[PDB]
Amino acid sequence: VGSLNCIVAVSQNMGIGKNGDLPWPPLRNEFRYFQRMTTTSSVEGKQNLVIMGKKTWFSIPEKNRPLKGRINLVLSRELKEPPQGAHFLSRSLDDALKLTEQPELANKVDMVWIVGGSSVYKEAMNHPGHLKLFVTRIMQDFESDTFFPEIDLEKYKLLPEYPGVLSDVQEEKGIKYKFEVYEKND
Ligand SMILES: NC(=O)C1=CN([C@@H]2O[C@H](COP(=O)(O)OP(=O)(O)OC[C@H]3O[C@@H](n4cnc5c(N)ncnc54)[C@@H](OP(=O)(O)O)[C@@H]3O)[C@@H](O)[C@H]2O)C=CC1
Ligand SMILES: COc1ccc(OCCCCC(=O)O)cc1Cc1cnc(N)nc1N
Protein backbone atom coordinates (compact mmCIF):
# COMPACT_ATOMS: atom_id res chain seq x y z
CA VAL A 1 0.00 0.00 0.00
CA GLY A 2 1.29 3.46 -0.93
CA SER A 3 0.99 6.90 0.63
CA LEU A 4 -1.75 8.20 2.91
CA ASN A 5 -3.27 11.55 1.97
CA CYS A 6 -6.14 13.89 2.70
CA ILE A 7 -7.70 16.07 0.02
CA VAL A 8 -10.02 19.01 0.72
CA ALA A 9 -11.21 22.35 -0.60
CA VAL A 10 -11.66 24.95 2.17
CA SER A 11 -12.83 28.53 2.43
CA GLN A 12 -10.96 31.31 4.25
CA ASN A 13 -13.19 30.73 7.29
CA MET A 14 -12.25 27.01 7.20
CA GLY A 15 -15.60 25.91 5.77
CA ILE A 16 -15.89 22.66 3.85
CA GLY A 17 -19.67 22.13 3.71
CA LYS A 18 -23.12 23.63 4.19
CA ASN A 19 -26.34 21.61 4.35
CA GLY A 20 -24.64 18.56 2.84
CA ASP A 21 -23.14 20.41 -0.13
CA LEU A 22 -20.12 22.62 -0.79
CA PRO A 23 -20.38 26.23 0.54
CA TRP A 24 -19.39 27.76 -2.85
CA PRO A 25 -20.89 27.34 -6.34
CA PRO A 26 -19.46 24.53 -8.52
CA LEU A 27 -15.86 25.06 -9.60
CA ARG A 28 -15.50 22.73 -12.55
CA ASN A 29 -11.71 22.73 -12.82
CA GLU A 30 -11.34 22.34 -9.04
CA PHE A 31 -13.48 19.17 -9.27
CA ARG A 32 -11.31 18.02 -12.20
CA TYR A 33 -8.25 18.49 -9.95
CA PHE A 34 -9.87 16.35 -7.23
CA GLN A 35 -10.68 13.68 -9.82
CA ARG A 36 -7.17 13.70 -11.25
CA MET A 37 -5.36 13.60 -7.90
CA THR A 38 -7.45 10.87 -6.32
CA THR A 39 -7.61 8.69 -9.46
CA THR A 40 -4.03 8.82 -10.73
CA SER A 41 -2.10 5.82 -9.42
CA SER A 42 1.70 5.71 -9.41
CA VAL A 43 1.72 1.88 -9.67
CA GLU A 44 0.75 -0.46 -12.56
CA GLY A 45 -2.13 -2.86 -11.83
CA LYS A 46 -3.39 -0.94 -8.79
CA GLN A 47 -6.11 1.61 -8.01
CA ASN A 48 -6.22 4.28 -5.34
CA LEU A 49 -8.59 3.85 -2.38
CA VAL A 50 -10.90 6.67 -1.28
CA ILE A 51 -12.05 6.66 2.33
CA MET A 52 -14.98 8.79 3.43
CA GLY A 53 -17.58 9.15 6.13
CA LYS A 54 -21.21 8.25 5.55
CA LYS A 55 -22.46 11.83 5.14
CA THR A 56 -19.65 12.53 2.65
CA TRP A 57 -20.64 9.48 0.60
CA PHE A 58 -24.27 10.64 0.41
CA SER A 59 -23.16 14.19 -0.46
CA ILE A 60 -21.74 12.93 -3.75
CA PRO A 61 -24.36 13.02 -6.53
CA GLU A 62 -25.57 9.47 -7.29
CA LYS A 63 -24.34 9.81 -10.89
CA ASN A 64 -20.78 10.31 -9.55
CA ARG A 65 -21.03 7.42 -7.04
CA PRO A 66 -18.89 5.35 -6.65
CA LEU A 67 -15.99 7.61 -7.62
CA LYS A 68 -14.97 5.88 -10.84
CA GLY A 69 -11.61 4.14 -11.20
CA ARG A 70 -11.07 4.19 -7.42
CA ILE A 71 -11.96 1.72 -4.67
CA ASN A 72 -14.63 3.38 -2.52
CA LEU A 73 -14.72 2.70 1.23
CA VAL A 74 -17.31 4.23 3.58
CA LEU A 75 -16.94 4.66 7.35
CA SER A 76 -19.99 3.99 9.52
CA ARG A 77 -20.92 2.23 12.76
CA GLU A 78 -24.68 2.39 11.97
CA LEU A 79 -24.60 0.78 8.52
CA LYS A 80 -24.51 -3.02 8.38
CA GLU A 81 -23.18 -3.20 4.81
CA PRO A 82 -21.64 -0.86 2.21
CA PRO A 83 -24.16 1.58 0.71
CA GLN A 84 -25.48 0.92 -2.77
CA GLY A 85 -22.58 1.50 -5.17
CA ALA A 86 -19.87 1.47 -2.49
CA HIS A 87 -17.23 -1.29 -2.29
CA PHE A 88 -16.22 -1.49 1.38
CA LEU A 89 -17.48 -0.52 4.83
CA SER A 90 -15.38 -0.06 7.99
CA ARG A 91 -16.33 1.00 11.55
CA SER A 92 -13.26 3.20 12.09
CA LEU A 93 -10.36 4.77 10.19
CA ASP A 94 -7.95 2.40 11.96
CA ASP A 95 -10.07 -0.54 10.77
CA ALA A 96 -10.09 0.81 7.20
CA LEU A 97 -6.29 1.23 7.18
CA LYS A 98 -5.83 -2.28 8.65
CA LEU A 99 -8.21 -3.62 5.96
CA THR A 100 -5.90 -2.36 3.20
CA GLU A 101 -3.29 -4.80 4.60
CA GLN A 102 -5.62 -7.82 4.24
CA PRO A 103 -5.06 -10.21 1.26
CA GLU A 104 -8.20 -8.88 -0.48
CA LEU A 105 -6.70 -5.36 -0.81
CA ALA A 106 -2.96 -5.59 -0.03
CA ASN A 107 -1.98 -5.96 -3.70
CA LYS A 108 -4.81 -3.86 -5.17
CA VAL A 109 -4.42 -0.48 -3.45
CA ASP A 110 -1.81 2.14 -4.21
CA MET A 111 -2.52 5.54 -2.62
CA VAL A 112 -5.16 6.13 -0.02
CA TRP A 113 -7.12 9.38 -0.13
CA ILE A 114 -9.23 10.53 2.79
CA VAL A 115 -11.91 12.72 1.30
CA GLY A 116 -13.90 13.77 4.40
CA GLY A 117 -15.68 14.70 6.45
CA SER A 118 -14.45 16.76 9.40
CA SER A 119 -14.10 13.99 11.99
CA VAL A 120 -12.32 11.70 9.51
CA TYR A 121 -9.89 14.47 8.54
CA LYS A 122 -9.24 15.25 12.23
CA GLU A 123 -8.46 11.63 13.13
CA ALA A 124 -6.16 11.21 10.14
CA MET A 125 -4.40 14.52 10.82
CA ASN A 126 -3.60 13.63 14.46
CA HIS A 127 -2.59 10.03 13.77
CA PRO A 128 1.19 9.43 13.98
CA GLY A 129 2.92 8.71 10.66
CA HIS A 130 3.64 10.01 7.18
CA LEU A 131 0.71 12.03 5.81
CA LYS A 132 0.13 14.65 3.13
CA LEU A 133 -2.68 17.17 2.92
CA PHE A 134 -3.76 18.40 -0.50
CA VAL A 135 -5.57 21.62 0.33
CA THR A 136 -7.37 23.92 -2.08
CA ARG A 137 -7.60 27.38 -0.50
CA ILE A 138 -10.82 29.03 -1.68
CA MET A 139 -9.82 32.63 -1.12
CA GLN A 140 -13.04 34.08 0.30
CA ASP A 141 -15.42 33.53 3.18
CA PHE A 142 -18.44 31.28 2.62
CA GLU A 143 -21.24 30.46 5.04
CA SER A 144 -20.61 26.93 6.27
CA ASP A 145 -21.85 24.39 8.80
CA THR A 146 -18.90 21.97 8.68
CA PHE A 147 -15.23 22.93 8.98
CA PHE A 148 -11.75 21.65 8.28
CA PRO A 149 -9.72 20.83 11.40
CA GLU A 150 -6.79 22.99 12.43
CA ILE A 151 -3.59 22.35 10.48
CA ASP A 152 -0.69 22.32 12.98
CA LEU A 153 2.06 23.99 10.98
CA GLU A 154 4.68 22.90 13.50
CA LYS A 155 4.12 19.37 12.07
CA TYR A 156 2.69 20.05 8.58
CA LYS A 157 5.19 21.65 6.24
CA LEU A 158 3.83 23.58 3.27
CA LEU A 159 5.76 22.25 0.26
CA PRO A 160 7.37 24.87 -1.97
CA GLU A 161 6.43 22.90 -5.12
CA TYR A 162 4.77 19.60 -6.05
CA PRO A 163 4.67 17.82 -9.45
CA GLY A 164 1.27 17.97 -11.15
CA VAL A 165 0.01 20.77 -8.91
CA LEU A 166 -0.28 24.30 -10.29
CA SER A 167 1.39 26.93 -8.08
CA ASP A 168 -0.36 30.08 -9.26
CA VAL A 169 -3.76 31.58 -8.48
CA GLN A 170 -6.77 29.98 -10.16
CA GLU A 171 -10.12 31.62 -10.75
CA GLU A 172 -13.52 30.15 -11.58
CA LYS A 173 -16.91 31.90 -11.40
CA GLY A 174 -15.20 35.00 -9.97
CA ILE A 175 -13.74 32.96 -7.09
CA LYS A 176 -9.96 32.89 -6.68
CA TYR A 177 -8.34 29.78 -5.24
CA LYS A 178 -4.93 28.13 -5.02
CA PHE A 179 -3.55 24.64 -4.51
CA GLU A 180 -1.29 23.66 -1.58
CA VAL A 181 0.42 20.48 -0.47
CA TYR A 182 1.42 19.87 3.20
CA GLU A 183 3.49 17.01 4.55
CA LYS A 184 4.12 15.68 8.04
CA ASN A 185 6.08 12.68 9.26
CA ASP A 186 5.88 11.89 12.98
N1 LIG B 1 -14.99 20.80 0.77
C2 LIG B 1 -14.50 19.55 0.78
O3 LIG B 1 -13.42 19.24 0.31
C4 LIG B 1 -15.38 18.49 1.45
C5 LIG B 1 -16.62 18.84 1.94
N6 LIG B 1 -17.41 17.88 2.56
C7 LIG B 1 -18.72 18.31 3.07
O8 LIG B 1 -18.76 18.01 4.48
C9 LIG B 1 -20.14 17.77 4.73
C10 LIG B 1 -20.31 17.04 6.03
O11 LIG B 1 -19.34 16.02 6.31
P12 LIG B 1 -19.39 15.62 7.84
O13 LIG B 1 -20.63 16.23 8.37
O14 LIG B 1 -18.10 15.91 8.49
O15 LIG B 1 -19.65 14.00 7.81
P16 LIG B 1 -18.82 12.56 7.53
O17 LIG B 1 -18.74 12.31 6.09
O18 LIG B 1 -17.56 12.41 8.29
O19 LIG B 1 -19.95 11.60 8.07
C20 LIG B 1 -20.27 11.59 9.44
C21 LIG B 1 -20.90 10.27 9.59
O22 LIG B 1 -19.93 9.39 8.87
C23 LIG B 1 -19.73 8.22 9.67
N24 LIG B 1 -18.31 8.30 10.29
C25 LIG B 1 -17.50 9.38 10.29
N26 LIG B 1 -16.33 9.08 10.87
C27 LIG B 1 -16.36 7.80 11.22
C28 LIG B 1 -15.44 6.94 11.84
N29 LIG B 1 -14.23 7.37 12.22
N30 LIG B 1 -15.79 5.66 12.06
C31 LIG B 1 -16.98 5.21 11.69
N32 LIG B 1 -17.87 6.00 11.10
C33 LIG B 1 -17.60 7.29 10.85
C34 LIG B 1 -21.06 8.34 10.42
O35 LIG B 1 -21.12 7.41 11.39
P36 LIG B 1 -22.46 6.62 11.67
O37 LIG B 1 -23.27 6.09 10.37
O38 LIG B 1 -21.91 5.52 12.48
O39 LIG B 1 -23.36 7.60 12.59
C40 LIG B 1 -20.98 9.73 10.98
O41 LIG B 1 -22.22 10.10 11.60
C42 LIG B 1 -20.59 16.88 3.57
O43 LIG B 1 -21.99 17.00 3.36
C44 LIG B 1 -19.80 17.46 2.40
O45 LIG B 1 -20.59 18.30 1.55
C46 LIG B 1 -16.99 16.54 2.69
C47 LIG B 1 -15.74 16.19 2.20
C48 LIG B 1 -14.94 17.16 1.59
C1 LIG C 1 -16.01 14.02 -0.85
O2 LIG C 1 -15.20 14.96 -1.56
C3 LIG C 1 -15.62 15.16 -2.84
C4 LIG C 1 -16.07 14.10 -3.62
C5 LIG C 1 -16.47 14.34 -4.93
C6 LIG C 1 -16.44 15.64 -5.43
O7 LIG C 1 -16.84 15.88 -6.71
C8 LIG C 1 -15.71 16.04 -7.55
C9 LIG C 1 -16.06 15.59 -8.96
C10 LIG C 1 -14.85 14.89 -9.55
C11 LIG C 1 -15.31 13.69 -10.37
C12 LIG C 1 -14.61 12.40 -9.94
O13 LIG C 1 -13.72 12.45 -9.05
O14 LIG C 1 -14.98 11.36 -10.52
C15 LIG C 1 -15.99 16.69 -4.63
C16 LIG C 1 -15.57 16.46 -3.33
C17 LIG C 1 -15.11 17.68 -2.51
C18 LIG C 1 -13.65 18.08 -2.76
C19 LIG C 1 -13.44 19.06 -3.72
N20 LIG C 1 -12.20 19.47 -3.97
C21 LIG C 1 -11.13 18.98 -3.30
N22 LIG C 1 -9.92 19.43 -3.58
N23 LIG C 1 -11.27 18.06 -2.35
C24 LIG C 1 -12.51 17.60 -2.08
N25 LIG C 1 -12.62 16.67 -1.14
184: containing domain: 1-186
- Cβ-count burial 47-79 (b if 16+ within 10 Å, e if not): ebbbbbbbbbbebbeeeebbbeebbbbbbbeee
Domain with 163 in it: what CATH number? Answer: 3.40.430.10
Ligand 2 test: best mutation among 30, 34, 41, 137, most atoms within 8 Å of CB? Answer: 34
- Our count of domains for the chain comes to 1
The DSSP code sequence of 159-178 is: PS--TT---S-EEETTEEEE
* Ligand with an atom nearest the CA of residue 39: 2
Distance CA 43, CA 112 (A): 13
The amino acid present at 97, given as its one-letter code, is: L
Give me the phi and psi of 4, to 5 degrees please.
-110, 135
CA–CA separation, 29 and 34 (whole Å): 9
Question: Which residues sit with their C-beta closer than 6 Å to ligand 2?
Answer: 7-9, 30-31, 34-35, 52, 56, 60, 64, 67-68, 115-116, 136
Single out the residue of 117, 13, 105 nearest to residue 74, CA to CA.
117
Distance of CA 132 to the CA centre of its chain: 10
